[model samples]
Target: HHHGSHMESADLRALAKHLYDSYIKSFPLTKAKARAILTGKTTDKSPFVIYDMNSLMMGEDKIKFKHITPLQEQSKEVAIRIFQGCQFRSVEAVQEITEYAKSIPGFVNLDLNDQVTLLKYGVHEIIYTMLASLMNKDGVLISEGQGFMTREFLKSLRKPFGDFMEPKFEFAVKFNALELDDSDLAIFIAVIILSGDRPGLLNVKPIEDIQDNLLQALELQLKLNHPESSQLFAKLLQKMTDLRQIVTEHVQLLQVIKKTETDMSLHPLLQEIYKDLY
Candidate 1:
C-alpha cells in the first residue's frame, strides 16, 4: 500500500528534502556536533557545561504546593527531578513535533482531533528517538545540547522508579549504533508520527499509506546510505517495536509516580499524552 512507486523520483526527493530540513530545524540535536563533543577539541568555548543535580534542583525543589499532599520520603525527590528535566524539554519539543508532523505532505489532511491523538500517542516516542542524538553510552546532553548529565548520576537514584534512565539509555545507545544521520531519522520519525496503528486513529488509509511510503523510502535511503549495513533496515524497524514497549513501560511507571507526587503538576500537554490511563 506504499505510494513511493507512483511518486516520481523528483517527488520522493523533494519529500526527503523537505523532511530532512524540517527535522534538522525542528529537532535540538547533539549528534550533528558529535565531533566537537568527543574529540577533546572543545576548550576555550566548549559547548559543554556540567550543572550539579542539587544546583539544578535549587529553584525547582522548594515549591509552593497548590495543596498539601503527603509524599512518602522514599527517594521521591529523584522522581520529581527526572520529571522536571523532561518538563524543561517538553515545551519546545512539543511545538517542534507538531510543526514537523504538519510539514508532511498528507498529515495536515488528517482530522484535527485525529492529529492531536496521533501526537498524544507518538510524541514521547519521538522524544525518546531524538534522545539518541543527544546521548552516548554514558549520558545525555541536556539544556539545549550544551549540558552533559551522566548515566551514573541517574542510576544513583533508587530503582523501580529511579530506574527509568537505564531502559532509555539502552534504547538511545542501541539506536546510536545504527549511526543514522538526521536525514535517515527524518523519515523514521515520520513513520512513527504518521502511524495508522496507534490507538484511536479515526482515519487509517492515508496514515497507512504515509507510513508505508516512509518505510519504503527509509529502506531505500538506508540501502544507499549504508550499503554495507545488510539488515540495518530490519533492525531499525524492530526499534519501533522496542520504542513502543518503552513508552508502555513509562506509562506503567508514571501511574505510580503521579501518586507519589500528587502535589506536583505534570506539564498539561505531557499529561494529555500520558492521559486516559484509567
Candidate 2:
C-alpha cells in the first residue's frame, strides 16, 4: 500500500512536469517577440483587438495632431459598440485561461466550487501579468501591431475607469523591464493558479503543495536564467503582491462603474464574478 501511494505521487509529479514543459513550448509569445510586436517592429498581427472605449476614451478630447487636422467627435453609439466588442474579447481570453487551468495536472481534483473560486480571484491577476509581458513603456498593443495608442490618450477615457488602468500600466512597464522569458511566465502563472490563499478553498494543503513545487521550480529556473541577478526572484515575488493590490483597485473601480454606469453593459461572466466577490 505504501509503495502504491508513492508510485501514484511520482506519476502525478511526472505528469505535472510534462504539462509544464508543453505549456512553455506552446506559449505563443516570448519576451523578445512580445516586445517586438508591442513596438510595431513585428509583421505578425494579433487575431483580435480588445478595445474598451471606457478604458481608452478613444474619441474624447480632440487634441490637435501635428501632422493631421483636428479629430471629429466620436459618436456614443460607436463607442458602445467598441466597448461591447472589447468586452466579448476579454471574456474569451478569460475562458481560454479557465480551460488552461483545468488542463493542468491535478487541478480538476478540487471541488467544483473551489475551482471556480480560485479562478474568480486569480484570473484577472494572470491576465494583467500576461498583459504586462506584452506591454512597452509607451502603451499596450491594440489591434496587434496595426494600431498604437498613446498612454496619454488612454488615460483620458473617464474618471475611475481610467484610474483603474493606471496602476496596471505602471506595473506592466516595470515588469516588462524585468524581461522574464516565457518559461518564467509559464511557471509564475502556474504558481498563481495553485495558490491556497484564496477564500473558500475546500482543501488548502494540496494546493499549497502544488504551489510550493511550482515556486521551487521557478526559483531554480530563475537562477539558471538570470545567474548574475540575486534579487530577481525576490522582485518577481513582490510583483505578485503588487498584482493583488492592482486587482483590488480594479474591483473597486468596477463597483464604481456598476453604480454609475447603469446604462453601460458589462460581460455577464464579469458581472457574475463581481457579484460573487461582493
Candidate 3:
C-alpha cells in the first residue's frame, strides 16, 4: 500500500497510453474509427477516470449480459428508445445525478462547459437505469423474439421529433439500426470495466468480488447460444474482453500516476471523474 501510494504521476499517463493502445489492438480500431462511428474522441489520457472508477465500484458483473440478449441488439435498441422517451424523466434524474456530482470536491465549482459535459454523462446514467427497468417487460426480445415490437406498435413510436413536436415520446426505427454501433459499444465497455475496478481500490471486498463475478456471468451468458439475436451479445462480449486488457493496463498506469507528488492540472471531465474520490 505504501508503495502503491508513492507512485509517480507519469505512471498514470503511461498506464493510460498502454490501455488505449490495447484498446486499439484488441478491436483493431483507431480513435478516428471510434469518432466516425461513436461520436466520441479516444485519447491516451482520459478525463473520465473518476467516473470510470465509480462505475467500477458499482460492480462490473452487474452488467447482466444474459439479460441483454444474444445480439445485444435489444439492449442497444431499448437503451436508445428509453433515452428518446426519457425526456419525461430526464430533468429530474439529471438533477439527482448532478446533485450527487456536486458533492464531489471540484465538481461543485465547475464552469458552464464543464457542467454541461457532466450533465450529458448524467443523462447517460439514467438511460442505463431505463434499460435495467426494461428487463422485466422484454426479457427475450433480442434473444428469442418473445416480446419484440409488432408492426403497429413500431409505427406509433417511429417518428422523430420535428420542430413542431411537443415533448412527446418518439422512436424512429432507424434509431435501432444505429444504437449498438462501435462508439456506443466502446462507452459501454469502458463503464463496465471501470466500475469493476473501483471497489478493489475502495477496499470494498464483497462489492469488488461481485464486480468480477458479474463480468464472468456476462461472458458465460454470451457463449450459450447461436441465434441471430445472440449476435449482439457476442459482439458486446468481444468488446468487453478487448476492454479488459486495456483496463488492466490503465490500472497499472494509474498506480504509477498516483505516486507522484505533483498536482493534476484538472480538466473539466477529469475533475468530474475524480471529484468523488475526495
Predicted model with the maximum lDDT: 1
**Models sorted by TM-score, best on top:** 1, 2, 3
Output the better candidate (2/3) by lDDT: 2
Better of 1 and 3 by TM-score: 1
TM-score of 3: 0.24
Show pairs that collide, candidate 1. Answer: none
Tens-digit lDDT track for model 1 on 15-126? 7888988887776553666535744555634444334566445534433422223467637665565666677567668898998999887899888888998899999999
Which lDDT tens digits does candidate 2 get at residues 1-278? 11234564555445556656656454445556767776557677632332455433443333232222234634434334334544554665677677768766678888788789889999889878887765666666543333555556556554444455567788887887777877677778878988899988889998887777777667766776786776888999998998898788877776765677676666678667654653
**Each prediction's whole-model lDDT (CA):** 0.74, 0.67, 0.34
Using all chains and alpha carbons, the TM-scores for the candidates as numbered come to: 0.81, 0.74, 0.24
Total residue pair clashes for candidate 3: 27
Query: Per-residue CA lDDT of candidate 3, range 1-278, in tens?
Result: 01232344244334334434433444333324433322224333321111222332242243342223346444334333332333333344455445434432233344545445534533443334223222222120111111222222322332331111111112212223323433333333333432423321333343334334434433333332223354555455454454345435534543443354143223457545433542
Q: Every model's Cα RMSD, please?
A: 5.9, 8.3, 21.9
Number of clashes found in candidate 1: 0
